[PDB]
Point group: D3
């Protein structure tokens, strides 16, 4: 159920076939066409104008560089281009039509009243053009390539954490020292590292770009609740599985019995854990805010136990 | 070990390099060439004719629109095109050669007797042509883009279900009401929702398109067996992980002891579960049937328990 | 380590051999001798006068009826009898000497300065006499047959309770009723009786007579602590094992799911339990107080559980 | 299956009815008769002479003081008494006949060839006499009152130890100290006392007198084996249940994590335990050796555990 | 709550003090008096005649040898004796008065209308006499010494069996044989003996004599129920703890894997078990029937397990 | 943190936009340009020359076919091409600049001193050219398409294996045969197949091409350690999840008890398992060696148990 951006968010319109983006400028000569991505080119950014009235459910595509809006028509030439007036003409309103299968993240930009669909191709000219909406070709599909967004915050819904698996893992058994009887001090040292896992999966809301790099703040099961381990300072990649080391350190001493051989077994509960969360983002150029819901999942550890027992 | 369709199933031949499909028509002028996908164009569909005799193991590619077969030769011009007779000429028989790595779902269409390989590119003309089979280039690879198939049924192999993980999850503890002694009624209400998971992974047989949308029928562990929960009415996407809510509802009352404070703990076993299955499909245009084996996997819950205990 | 009564407590001196008790009266003629027990005869009761000075560690035996004290001598005749003055003569001081084996609850009453030991027999006259302390015969042994004491209170040392064994016992499984789906009410009834056990064992202090009948107040394990079940109104016999019935009663109803067959399993933890205690007693004739420490032991039950589960 | 002493062991013959013992001396006048027990009187001790030949299975009763043997006859007077020659006359051989119920530890001493049974009573004279073996009266029963035996050793059959019950008992939970983070030392102290139980029950062999006092050496479950705790220095009473204190002492320190609140739970497994054993005894006057098999039973504790866990 | 025999059951009246029994014959001269027990003497047996009308709640004591009834009066001499007419005179009706403590199994035989209590002593004549009921002495107490009864049957109330403790006991671990790979046969043998325990404790009904010897039929826990092991052919002693051996025997073979070292662990659940029961008895001389309820208790074993596991 | 190949390893430079590779030959005429991949064309292979001195951190791109190095300049024409001298000119040194998001596996090849960036496109000529480094377009990105490498060995770091989940799965219960008593032989057969899982995930080091086919050697949990099952002979695909069958076979016989019905339950522990590993590879053309660290993960089974129990 596709995410369409609200009015103040910018994006590029990437064509499935052309693998190129639409541009709209005042000059040079060709004012609208296709181009390889250049994040710094205002020329390639657009935002949507939500139609109202008989246009409710449709959208106008406003150029960020020129402020003009796109149009698609069949009678007059050229069939596509820019024009003033934020949607003054019926030629400026488009219906966003999601594709299926390999095109489920893509969609056509069909302008109803003229029965025309936007075209983006590099195999035939004009590269940026339109076609009778009834004949569907793959080069009529577009996807959103949103503006660079900064992930400002991650807020976990700890109350809804969940243990998906759990098996005890003995970190260190050995660590058993003796001295017959009397003695006095027997201290142990524990330093075990476990490779943990982390994945921030999209659930709903703003569609963050896969691989987006952001930082720390990862879930942990306490003993009766889930909590956030602010120490994990690794760099995460949105939508992808990352790994990180967790080291358990501990030092404890014993000796006080009639005379025994002390054994120390350090154990932890390891397993798969997951927690819901909400991410807060804002436009780097505008500060425009949005949110994204997601579920965080990972292999983790909890309940570090130290068991002491004497022998003879 | 690549899936080659039987004789009555249609498909498009998508080129790795051109990202375009082969077409074969009677008119306009250029009767065979490349084109962006248009699912409604019979022009782009083909089926295979299984070679026999000295042609066993080879195939002819029959156009659905014209009924003619493709050919690849080096002497006479043009080197590729259409021709009558379901494989009358040695020029019509092809060897399907699977690629590796990034080309493991692709293959070359090599016509042995002429030592020629089909070509599909957009960087050089002719776009649809052939090349000496000994010199291998990426633009010689094709993949099947099968006709739209309807998923008519999913039959789970319940006897072979399997619990991959299991940990108790307390849905609701609290829910403990008192009234000292005497009293008479103490009823509790349980309404807890768990986000479940679902994935239909391909194992063998017909290669269903990733993302194909179909409906319900998902596995559940009873107490000693696996069963199908027909209530889950969510829309699934083949080959992809989906999520769905499961709500546990229950109402029970107590009170009948010498006078106590009743506590109610509702618990469930949550964990990863998987089950084998077979999907039955048919051509939307023909009704031609095929099957696909797969393994279904998901995070689930089972064995809802309600424990009652008095206090003082 | 024998219990010798303090100065204000009365008792009878029962002879091992004679199986008769010593009496001391002013009249009839024979003022001191032996007699079968008659609890109402003041004639048979005595109390001890704790020696001091060079008599510390020795005792005088004062008659309750006459107030006179017993004496044991060898020169003058008769060798035993009564005399005024609470221990005026060296003839009135006795050493209490515990026996062993079958005589561990008995003891000789040896009067040191004369080297004489009290005698209590029915096979030879005089029945009540003495003998040279160096020649030990069984008829020189006595035991205390204390005055009737009332058990006023039992105070358990709950903090020190202890579970000696524990095994779950299913009181009632069956109790599973259905009605397919919809329905609305499904209430269960539980009434199970377990034969419990109870024994009040002597540990130290006043030696209560075995079989003494007294009432209620018996230990029970709560969930984290031991508590006293004041409901058990059975009559106990000190030092002996008693039995008593414990009935578990409960009524609870369910039904609120999409439609299932409800099962109810009522379970308890049964096992051996024991707890230390102190008993407070007083003389029925005097009100003289004493205490007795003991350990209470018994087969019991705890943690009644009711588990609800649906089926299909 | 009654224990009859071998030839070199001495005993007294206690009568059920008379509750007196048989004596055989050279002087004064009455050389054989009844008497209250006097352990120092050689006069009351006897040993058995195992019959052989046609007397196999019968026994002669030899006086320790005079060395003569007892006889029972009907023609000549007196019917019972002493005589020289270790069983020269048929009058000296007796059949030991065990009684039942309240007489299961008693037996008649029947002299077959004369059809006479020994009598021991105080209600009619002669007190020590005989009666026609066919008419059985309670005063014809005797029991062995063996000479004082010293318990020299107890050897447990550890390999055959057995846990009859087992339940964890938390000795001390609390003992949890914090200091936020950093800190450095957090040591705990454990001192918990449990009242243990001990009983040495007769199984076979020499019948040790109930209540016989002897010392230490009591079973304990290690972790995989049973062992003897030589520290328990309490005084035991054969055949009776004794109690003794067991104190667990321990001191251990921790602190070494990123900063937590340490909790320490000391736990033990308590339950009923039993082990077979053999006791070695010898005559205090002779050094004559014998053994006694038995099973030792008691409430004990094992596997002291110390579990460390941090909190926040 | 003392067991008084119904009309057709015979018994002896044993005196607490005299430790002798009452006899009633037609000749010799003294027709009623005291005597040491002689089970074969009809002379010592009596049965009760349950009073009715104004005598309801009282009893007459009928001699088995003479058929006459006992009487207790104060005016006429002798005060006690025999008389014809099954209770014709008011002198023949007695009130049975249970004692307490050491006399809880004894009772006085008080004849109300004359205010007299039966006496049984050997320290003063007449030995069998009576006394003013208001002055209570120990020699006024009697207890029942019932006729020899045969235990014909024991019927356990299996449904009410109960596990009081339970701990796994490994009978034999070792028994692990290898041969690398291939091989073919690896059979194990199990022969382990456990010393079990058995006690038949009185609960209610006929008071069987302690120590009474009878045979087999002992409880066992199956897997979900209790059953009777008819194989245990040991001789039991009523009211006392007995022991008996239980041997577990088993032979099983394996070998069929890719090549491993087989280990076999034979384990059982041992613990304390108890079950209610009813015993059926009858008079050896009459066949008169009675029952006795009781609880059976013992250390037992159940659920023999054999676990097979390979190694490398 | 991108993997840049050391000096002796060859690769192709695939353009993000052109999806074509760079070639450098001596003839025909155009000596440098773009081309679809042809693994056999030496023409398309290059290796890097690690800059030193003021060029440390930069690289020269040496053609394998010609041995010449690439250059990028702005003054002189053509702006890009080949040249002798392994980095003689400042024009030959490039900075490798990793992209983000969809370009995280791609990078620009920027030549600093001229402020120029390599270009690879098919939408505008020249296809292989350069651009002012300050204006970034997607067609400036390249990725490594390494030479075919052979996976010579996989060495698991068994000591660091880890159980992520664990749940018992009963392979076969039923298999329970009887014959009442006596009998003699009762053998069982076990043959159960479980579909296991396997995935070799990249962690660090050489970036093996996804899908690369190689063979066997997969982890297994023993009982206390992880070991390699050399039997699994399946073909794996690097970076992708594969499946494989595991069959448990076993034959064992019993019968040796007093007469029972034998039941056999075969059980295993199934769950998710993972283990670190290092793969050793070498160039197929050179033998040049490299390594790749990775974590192996899969659904597995361990601890096959066979439990034997009798019934009646
Ligand atoms: C200038 C103009 O009107 N040109 C059009 C062509 O674009 C058009 O070609 C097709 O356009 C579709 C767009 O979805 C596909 O790109 C397809 O491959 C093209 O064939 C033809 C009619 O087909 O008409 C004019 O020439
Ligand atoms: C009309 C004709 O015969 N043309 C051919 C060219 O197609 C051929 O070019 C190559 O074809 C392969 C196909 O796998 C690749 O597309 C490659 O990039 C092309 O260079 C050349 C010979 O190379 O010969 C004729 O011109
Ligand atoms: C009156 C008097 O002095 N009589 C004594 C006897 O009592 C005494 O007899 C013994 O006393 C002891 C007491 O422990 C035992 O009862 C034993 O059975 C008796 O024999 C004798 C000496 O033995 O002397 C006087 O007769
Ligand atoms: C000297 C002599 O021969 N006396 C006997 C009596 O002892 C005997 O009395 C009985 O003996 C038995 C012994 O088991 C019981 O003690 C019983 O109570 C006595 O009655 C009588 C015969 O009965 O004969 C002689 O008098
Ligand atoms: C023949 C006669 O009447 N004798 C009685 C005695 O028996 C009686 O003695 C007491 O009887 C009681 C019975 O409970 C105890 O045995 C006690 O020890 C005896 O003293 C006396 C009165 O006491 O009267 C007559 O002599
Ligand atoms: C021969 C020459 O110098 N040509 C250049 C063009 O390549 C250049 O065009 C752009 O190049 C970038 C490379 O990152 C993109 O491909 C972009 O789409 C092109 O517009 C133009 C200046 O833009 O200048 C010359 O014509």
């Amino acid at each position: 159920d596709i995410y369409i951006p609200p009015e103040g968010l910018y994006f590029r319109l990437l064509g499935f076939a052309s693998r190129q983006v639409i541009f709209a400028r005042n000059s040079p000569s060709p004012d609208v066409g296709l181009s390889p991505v250049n994040d710094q080119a205002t020329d390639q950014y657009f935002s949507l104008i939500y139609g109202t009235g008989e246009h409710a459910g449709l959208y106008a595509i406003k150029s960020k560089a020129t402020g003009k809006v796109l149009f698609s028509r069949r009678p007059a030439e050229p069939y596509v281009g820019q024009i003033d007036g934020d949607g003054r003409y019926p030629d400026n309103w488009f219906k966003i039509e999601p594709g299926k299968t390999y095109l489920s993240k893509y969609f056509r930009l069909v302008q109803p009243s003229t029965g025309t669909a936007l075209v983006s191709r590099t195999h035939l000219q004009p590269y940026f053009w339109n076609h009778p909406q009834t004949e569907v070709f793959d080069d009529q599909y577009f996807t959103f390539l949103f503006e660079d967004m900064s992930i400002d915050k991650i807020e976990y819904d700890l109350k809804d954490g969940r243990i998906l698996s759990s098996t005890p893992n003995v970190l260190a058994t050995q660590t058993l020292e003796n001295t017959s009887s009397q003695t006095q001090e027997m201290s142990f040292n524990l330093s075990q590292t476990l490779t943990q896992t982390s994945t921030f999966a999209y659930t709903a809301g703003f569609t963050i770009a896969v691989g987006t790099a952001f930082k720390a703040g990862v879930p942990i099961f306490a003993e009766t609740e889930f909590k956030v381990d602010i120490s994990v300072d690794n760099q995460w990649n949105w939508g992808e599985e990352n790994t990180f080391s967790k080291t358990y350190t501990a030092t404890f001493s014993v000796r006080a019995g009639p005379g025994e051989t002390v054994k120390a077994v350090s154990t932890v509960d390891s397993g798969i854990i997951n927690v819901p969360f909400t991410a807060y983002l804002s436009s780097k150029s505008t500060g425009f805010e949005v949110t994204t819901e997601g579920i965080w999942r990972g292999v983790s550890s909890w309940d570090l136990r130290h068991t002491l027992t004497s022998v003879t």
